[PDB]
Each structure stands twice: as C-alpha cells, then as structure tokens.
Amino acid sequence: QRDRNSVKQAVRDTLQLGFPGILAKTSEGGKTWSYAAGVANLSSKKPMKTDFRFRIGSVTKTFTATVVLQLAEENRLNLDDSIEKWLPGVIQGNGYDDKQITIRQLLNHTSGIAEYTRSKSFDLMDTKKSYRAEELVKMGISMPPDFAPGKSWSYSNTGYVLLGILIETVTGNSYAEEIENRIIEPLELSNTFLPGNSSVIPGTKHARGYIQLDGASEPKDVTYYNPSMGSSAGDMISTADDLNKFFSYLLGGKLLKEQQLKQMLTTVPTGEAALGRYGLGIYETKLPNGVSIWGHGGSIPGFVTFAGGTLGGKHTLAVNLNSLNAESPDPFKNILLAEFSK
C-alpha cells in the first residue's frame, strides 16, 4: 500500500520553498486521496482547501493538443500539413519560412517561432491588458526565428496561440468552443472554465493567487489577472479533480484513439533537466526508479500547477500552488517522487 505520510510531508514541505498554500489530489486504482496545506489568503490566513479552482496555466496546452488531434482523427487536418496551407500570410517576415513549419512542430515546440513573452512590448506584471490572439502572434514574429523548422526545441507559447487560431480556421469554431464541446462537456469537467479575457476566477471556491519575482519582497495579490496573455497556450481554470479525470481519460485511451495517442506520446528531446522528452502538448517526467509520468505543468501569475499520470491512466496526480515564485520554478519534484515511487 501507498505511504501517504511521505506524500503529506512532501506536500507540506513544498511550502517552505516560499508558497502560501498547496492542494493536491491523487487517484490510483480508482482509490483517491486529498491533500492541502498552508493558506488561501496571506492576509486573513484562511486555510487552503483541496477542492479549490485555480488557473492551470500551460496545462491548457494539453487540452488544445487534444482538440488538434481529434481533428486529425476526423480527417480535418494533418499533423504534417504545413501551416502555410491553413494560415497563409501569417508567419512571415524576419526570415520566417511558413512552408517548412508544420502543425506537429507547433505542438512539440520545434517550429522555431519565437516566444512572445520575450518581447520588450510584453509585460507579465500588467494584470489588465486584453490581447487578441493575432496580437500575440505578431509580437512573437517581431523577433526572428530561433532556428529553422524542425532543427531544434524551444518552448513557444506563440505556437500554441497559433494553434488556437488554426483550430478555428479548420472548424469555424473558437478554440474554447472546441475544448468545451469535445472535452469539458463530455467528461463533465464541471469546475473547468475557459475565461477569455475576463479576469475573474468564478465563485468563492478558489484561493487568492500571488506572484513574487524576488524572495526579498512581499508576494503581490494577482488573483484578478487577464488570462488573454495565455489564450490557447495557458488560459484555463480547473480543479484537481477535473484534471485527474482529464489525464486519466487521455492516458487511458478514452479521449484520443490509439493512433492519435501514439502520436501525442511521440517525443523529441528538449535538452533540459527541465521538462524531459516533449510530445504533442504533453511531456515525460522520468523518475530514478524508472517510472514515467506523462503530463504538463503550468505557471501563470498567481498559480503553479502540475498534472499528469502513468501510461494507461490508472494512476494520476494534480497539484497546485497559489503563488508564482520565480526563485522556485520546479517545486513539485519531491511530491512526485513520493507519490510515484516505488
């Protein structure tokens, strides 16, 4: 049987890396467990609770990829189509060459399209600004390719913002409509939301979220933050339950059929103790013991998340912290070691 004390301990100690609070939930064999420590609110000291909603950030990428893959299954697009066929005139200038960029590459971050958040016109700490997706694309291509398509790996939100546009070009429906109609509604993910450019986290069932760019400063409350800077790369809100159910269905063969799931799990090297091997909106975290955890993290102001699971979908975890602490980018490593070892 699992030693849950070691998980509790690892959950609790994560706070000492400089976070207000933490929630996690695990499912294994259909046996669930819930964890929470620390506080939802640094000023009132109200406790973190396990069933809270949170901004999942880049875990959104896995939902977007899943839609793109269903579209491939239905013969509405091909992973190796060039994007020039779908979105001509978009990725150009600066030596970009769209005729060599494929849909597959956007999905696994090998396109070389530059990351819009490196632009000087981008400000993470602006908690208000509404961006249209095409503005983020243009911001990204304002900088030259990092490399030639397919020749290297580099994390690019720009590519996932582009994919959200693509989806709509393919079906006539917004990426949010597609995520809602294909994933949220059929899995009954009843605490999972696509907020657009609204800054609201709905309801009272969530914590305050914080950001701390520093260590030598107060964390700032950024609970209300405009998620349109993330779009189809990072805007979603969800819960530990809904994310467990999602990853368990995905990895257990219930959302993507075998042929598409195999493509999703075909990975490229990242070169990076950071992520491991990266697939289509999902990556492999390999533990010392030989265990592979497939899932994704997120990190958006207010909230740092990881969700994921074992191949076959029978063991998953989701975890969230309510602050973005730039000094501790990789906080979940011991939780995973406890929950998935041995």
Side-chain angles (χ1 to χ4, degrees):
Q1 282 208 340
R2 203 109 241 152
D3 185 19
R4 328 233 91 123
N5 263 273
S6 62
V7 185
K8 295 211 272 207
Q9 196 62 59
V11 164
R12 294 164 173 156
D13 293 341
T14 303
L15 306 177
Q16 299 171 232
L17 305 169
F19 298 96
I22 180 166
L23 60 85
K25 300 201 190 173
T26 61
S27 187
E28 172 167 27
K31 163 80 182 162
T32 52
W33 236 91
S34 279
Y35 300 85
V39 295
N41 181 332
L42 276 170
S43 136
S44 72
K45 310 270 284 132
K46 200 186 65 139
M48 185 67 75
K49 312 215 267 162
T50 52
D51 298 336
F52 281 175
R53 301 158 175 179
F54 47 88
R55 304 190 186 286
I56 76 183
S58 297
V59 182
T60 298
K61 296 189 171 65
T62 312
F63 289 83
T64 298
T66 296
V67 165
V68 174
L69 281 156
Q70 293 191 345
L71 290 180
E73 189 274 333
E74 293 163 15
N75 203 23
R76 303 302 298 290
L77 62 82
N78 306 307
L79 297 174
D80 296 315
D81 283 338
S82 163
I83 48 139
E84 187 270 340
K85 229 159 86 147
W86 286 104
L87 288 169
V90 175
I91 300 308
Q92 57 179 19
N94 271 350
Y96 280 106
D97 181 13
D98 67 350
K99 279 194 259 11
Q100 298 317 131
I101 296 171
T102 67
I103 292 173
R104 197 187 292 273
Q105 283 168 2
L106 297 181
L107 284 166
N108 64 205
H109 311 277
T110 62
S111 79
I113 297 177
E115 161 55 38
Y116 58 86
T117 54
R118 299 182 173 118
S119 165
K120 282 284 79 106
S121 59
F122 183 77
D123 179 2
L124 193 70
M125 296 297 289
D126 180 337
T127 67
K128 292 279 190 290
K129 185 184 238 134
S130 282
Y131 283 107
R132 306 172 185 302
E134 48 81 13
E135 299 172 271
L136 303 178
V137 177
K138 285 179 176 61
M139 189 180 298
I141 66 170
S142 77
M143 299 165 287
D146 288 320
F147 48 83
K151 299 312 190 208
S152 199
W153 187 90
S154 180
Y155 206 71
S156 184
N157 286 308
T158 315
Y160 272 72
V161 171
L162 233 205
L163 288 168
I165 293 176
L166 172 72
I167 283 158
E168 182 160 355
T169 298
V170 172
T171 62
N173 307 319
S174 71
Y175 71 77
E177 168 177 352
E178 294 292 352
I179 287 168
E180 179 77 2
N181 192 56
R182 288 170 180 279
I183 303 171
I184 296 172
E185 295 177 4
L187 270 57
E188 297 186 345
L189 302 189
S190 63
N191 287 283
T192 294
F193 306 89
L194 285 148
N197 60 357
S198 174
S199 67
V200 174
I201 304 163
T204 48
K205 278 209 309 210
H206 58 87
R208 297 264 134 181
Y210 299 88
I211 190 170
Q212 174 162 24
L213 283 177
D214 222 58
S217 44
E218 290 285 72
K220 183 173 185 281
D221 183 312
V222 288
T223 305
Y224 296 91
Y225 186 83
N226 188 140
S228 71
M229 53 67 77
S231 191
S232 49
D235 64 3
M236 292 171 64
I237 294 162
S238 195
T239 55
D241 279 346
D242 283 358
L243 293 183
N244 281 317
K245 190 163 180 189
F246 174 66
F247 279 95
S248 162
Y249 271 56
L250 178 54
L251 268 8
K254 299 203 216 108
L255 260 170
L256 298 183
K257 292 170 176 181
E258 169 177 40
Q259 176 142 50
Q260 278 66 234
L261 187 55
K262 289 226 304 268
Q263 302 304 312
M264 179 180 250
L265 304 178
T266 300
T267 67
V268 303
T270 60
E272 269 268 21
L275 282 29
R277 304 200 75 72
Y278 201 103
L280 308 187
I282 202 178
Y283 62 83
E284 185 193 29
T285 300
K286 265 296 305 214
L287 302 175
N289 65 345
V291 170
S292 266
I293 297 134
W294 287 97
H296 213 291
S299 178
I300 190 167
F303 298 95
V304 175
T305 305
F306 175 91
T310 237
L311 261 149
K314 283 255 282 318
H315 189 184
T316 60
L317 171 150
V319 58
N320 175 257
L321 296 160
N322 68 330
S323 176
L324 194 178
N325 188 342
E327 292 179 4
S328 313
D330 168 38
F332 297 125
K333 188 16 149 294
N334 298 327
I335 291 166
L336 295 175
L337 285 168
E339 167 65 21
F340 285 103
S341 302
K342 11 59 39 211

